[PDB]
Amino acid sequence: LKIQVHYYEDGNVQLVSHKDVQDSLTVSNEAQTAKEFIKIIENAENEYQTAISENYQTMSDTTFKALRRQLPVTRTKIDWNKILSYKIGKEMQ
Amino acid sequence: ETTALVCDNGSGLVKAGFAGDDAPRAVFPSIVGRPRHQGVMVGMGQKDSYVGDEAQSKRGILTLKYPIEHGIITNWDDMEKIWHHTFYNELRVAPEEHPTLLTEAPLNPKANREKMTQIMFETFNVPAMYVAIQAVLSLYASGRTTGIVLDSGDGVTHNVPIYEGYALPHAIMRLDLAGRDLTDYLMKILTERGYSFVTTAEREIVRDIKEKLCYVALDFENEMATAASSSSLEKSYELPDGQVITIGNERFRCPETLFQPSFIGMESAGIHETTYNSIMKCDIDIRKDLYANNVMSGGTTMYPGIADRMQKEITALAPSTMKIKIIAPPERKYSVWIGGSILASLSTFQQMWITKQEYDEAGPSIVHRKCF
Amino acid sequence: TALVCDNGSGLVKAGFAGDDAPRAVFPSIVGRPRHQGVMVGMGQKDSYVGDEAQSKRGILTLKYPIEHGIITNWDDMEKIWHHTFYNELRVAPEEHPTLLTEAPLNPKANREKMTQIMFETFNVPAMYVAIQAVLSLYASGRTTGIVLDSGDGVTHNVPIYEGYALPHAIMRLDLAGRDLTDYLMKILTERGYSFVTTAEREIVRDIKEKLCYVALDFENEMATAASSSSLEKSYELPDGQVITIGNERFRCPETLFQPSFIGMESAGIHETTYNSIMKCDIDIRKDLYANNVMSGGTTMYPGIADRMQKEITALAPSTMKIKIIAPPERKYSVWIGGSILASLSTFQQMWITKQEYDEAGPSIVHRKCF
Ligand SMILES: Nc1ncnc2c1ncn2[C@@H]1O[C@H](COP(=O)(O)OP(=O)(O)O)[C@@H](O)[C@H]1O
Ligand SMILES: Nc1ncnc2c1ncn2[C@@H]1O[C@H](COP(=O)(O)OP(=O)(O)O)[C@@H](O)[C@H]1O
Ligand SMILES: [Mg+2]
Ligand SMILES: [Mg+2]
């Protein structure tokens, strides 16, 4: 399963994604095995799309926070007149 | 060679000394006593006021006043007397050659800090002064960089979470319930057995009773049941006039107000719930290290049952998979002063002082610019 | 006669459909006794609801059943609905269909339990649940625009095109008037005033409703407040004490534009509105920029329209016309829109009746209702 999206209105953003799904099915006459094939296709692609949506839900707290936080751990903006007060607190082991 | 002075001005005690030492040189009560009777013998000293231990020595003929109530200085002339007796009588130094470090409770009025800066710079005129939060100094003395500090003294019980040296200001909580309210509540409940204490000198006696005989129960209802069942929890105390009193269940009802503030009519939650609310107002990925590094500081954390009770209450409030460790050092009565000496003995703190020329240029409002 | 009830996080606005104004506006609080009762020649209840709580709050602990838009206590919400139906409206809920309101982007179990309680305990012939910002746009006489709904628990930015809300552009900020009241309680400690109790929280709420405003330029307002005492205002306490605040009048609503003042990660309401507009298609952005509609009591600060105009003009392209509509009755705008919707002719076949709830269960509200 592959998805590719490009969006370039004022800047640029791209998404590439793929997933490999392996399952098994029983074999019978043509109509029943066709229905089973459609059923496993549905139950794979629905979970893939729902997982993509839930991954977009938690981007700003799990993966984007690992690169740049939205606020520091003090939950406030930096007081630029007190840089040494931030630097002093890490010198005591 | 201009060594710095570390002075902790609590609501009940003054802990003052030199930077670099491991123990405060001067520990004395923050009281001013004035005579309430008339003097009939002439030819003596007979001074109009008494500061510190001399006020406590002749407290029977004096009325006692505290210049600091709930962390806020209310009387400034009495605080002038306290600081003058600190510098010139308890330390024997001239405060023109030593920069000074002072402590303050969080969420205090700004006028208190401005007036402290003003009285340090043009009454006891210092080359430099700094004002610091007490709980971050307790964590500096504890040897950690992350953790939540519960500082409880005579006026203010405050919880401050610090993560890697960063004090987190939106999770700092303050309660105006401390050892003086506990002393007043024990003074009230001592009238059930017939012991009546009224005057300000007898408040010191009730405080001594509280320091010697009170403790925190692990389970309050079982302790009340076993106190009513048997006379095995009673203890006896001797008054200055030789009379003996006995308390059986006032020993654990007095520090139960720290866990149930409704005993004195207050609507606020307990210290355990305040700690849990301070942790829950932090970031979700740092709550493990905050739960593992609970630090207790101050004189009201010196009851000999309080760590196990706080452990039980926090473990009840916390989720079941979390590890809760509560650290109570044996020297936690003086922990703000030790961390203050550690902070004042550092090389990178020497640029953080508020100098005299900066006070002359900016007036008494630079303390909101250079100090947290 | 239909019933329109707006159960907000801080106020309850209920009345009959067709009237132009709500008939019952009362605080959504439950008060319980705190002290020892010593007199026996008295009523001596155990729970006080609404204004009776506010007239007795000095001996009471107050509780809000709704926190941050979602319902935390359901017994207290039952008490609120009982007091609304039987004491403030004097109606019988067995005879009247009842319209209900709900904030967007909410858990579904809240709507499930709302329908279950309204059909099993306060049995109505029919009920319906509507979105508040859509009704606030309906009350303003338009069908296309973006609604900024800021109340007591939530702030929402909802864009509606041709009567349909756009769910992929609904933005939710968890900052409203309760957080502003608590931040004012925090910043009044600098001048020496201590407010701790739940009764004093209402006093600080009254101070915020009476004295605060929104600065046009925050840095210049802080510069002018630190130069002279031309901005200091006085307030008289219930016990006769007089307090004076100088720069807390505009620092408290600045949390709407700088949410980091209380330690929240999200952006201000101007950036939230610009993000809600910018998620839409280009051909409707002109209509959404021209039709900004304010709603709720937290938009009642007397500086918020000009400041919002300045900030959205700064964010938007320079060829775009920005118009912000702040109706003078926007404290009651969800109720008026619900009155308009419930008095429509074709709306009468969109009621969820009791028979369909019997045949479906507590899940019909996700199929027949939005
Ligand atoms: N062992 C003890 N048990 C109970 N209370 C104590 C004990 N030691 C001190 N206290 C209380 O601590 C209060 C002051 O503690 P401390 O924090 O050291 O001073 P301050 O509050 O002035 O900073 C006193 O009022 C006293 O009642
Ligand atoms: N004049 C005013 N200025 C600022 N805020 C106000 C004013 N009047 C009311 N508010 C705020 O509006 C909030 C509730 O408004 P409203 O939206 O009508 O109720 P709800 O939020 O319960 O739906 C209250 O928290 C109150 O603080
Ligand atoms: Mg202290
Ligand atoms: Mg509302």
UniProtKB/Swiss-Prot annotation, chain A:
It comes from the Eukaryota. It is found in: Cytoplasm, Cytoskeleton. This is F-actin-capping protein subunit alpha-1. F-actin-capping proteins bind in a Ca(2+)-independent manner to the fast growing ends of actin filaments (barbed end) thereby blocking the exchange of subunits at these ends. Unlike other capping proteins (such as gelsolin and severin), these proteins do not sever actin filaments. May play a role in the formation of epithelial cell junctions. Forms, with CAPZB, the barbed end of the fast growing ends of actin filaments in the dynactin complex and stabilizes dynactin structure. Component of the F-actin capping complex, composed of a heterodimer of an alpha and a beta subunit. Subunit of dynactin, a multiprotein complex part of a tripartite complex with dynein and a adapter, such as BICDL1, BICD2 or HOOK3. The dynactin complex is built around ACTR1A/ACTB filament and consists of an actin-related filament composed of a shoulder domain, a pointed end and a barbed end. Its length is defined by its flexible shoulder domain. The soulder is composed of 2 DCTN1 subunits, 4 DCTN2 and 2 DCTN3. Belongs to the F-actin-capping protein alpha subunit family.
From Swiss-Prot, chain C:
The modification N6-methyllysine is found at residue 79. The gene is ACTA1. GO terms for cellular component: actin filament; actin filament bundle; cell body; cytoplasm; filamentous actin; filopodium; lamellipodium; skeletal muscle myofibril. SUPFAM superfamilies: Actin-like ATPase domain. One of its GO terms (molecular function) is ATP binding. This is Actin, alpha skeletal muscle. Residues 105-118, 353-365 are annotated as: Interaction with alpha-actinin. Its main location: cytoplasm. In vertebrates 3 main groups of actin isoforms, alpha, beta and gamma have been identified. The alpha actins are found in muscle tissues and are a major constituent of the contractile apparatus. The beta and gamma actins coexist in most cell types as components of the cytoskeleton and as mediators of internal cell motility. It is found in: Cytoplasm, Cytoskeleton. Keywords: Acetylation, ADP-ribosylation, ATP-binding, Cytoplasm, Cytoskeleton, Hydrolase, Methylation, Muscle protein, Nucleotide-binding, Oxidation. The modification Tele-methylhistidine is found at residue 68. CDD domains: ASKHA_NBD_actin. It catalyses: ATP + H2O = ADP + phosphate + H(+). The modification Methionine (R)-sulfoxide is found at residues 39, 42. Actins are highly conserved proteins that are involved in various types of cell motility and are ubiquitously expressed in all eukaryotic cells. PANTHER family: ACTIN. The modification ADP-ribosylarginine is found at residue 172. Oxidation of Met-39 and Met-42 by MICALs (MICAL1, MICAL2 or MICAL3) to form methionine sulfoxide promotes actin filament depolymerization. MICAL1 and MICAL2 produce the (R)-S-oxide form. The (R)-S-oxide form is reverted by MSRB1 and MSRB2, which promotes actin repolymerization. GO terms for biological process: actin filament bundle assembly; actin filament polymerization; mesenchyme migration; positive regulation of gene expression; skeletal muscle fiber development; skeletal muscle thin filament assembly. It is an enzyme of class 3 (hydrolase).
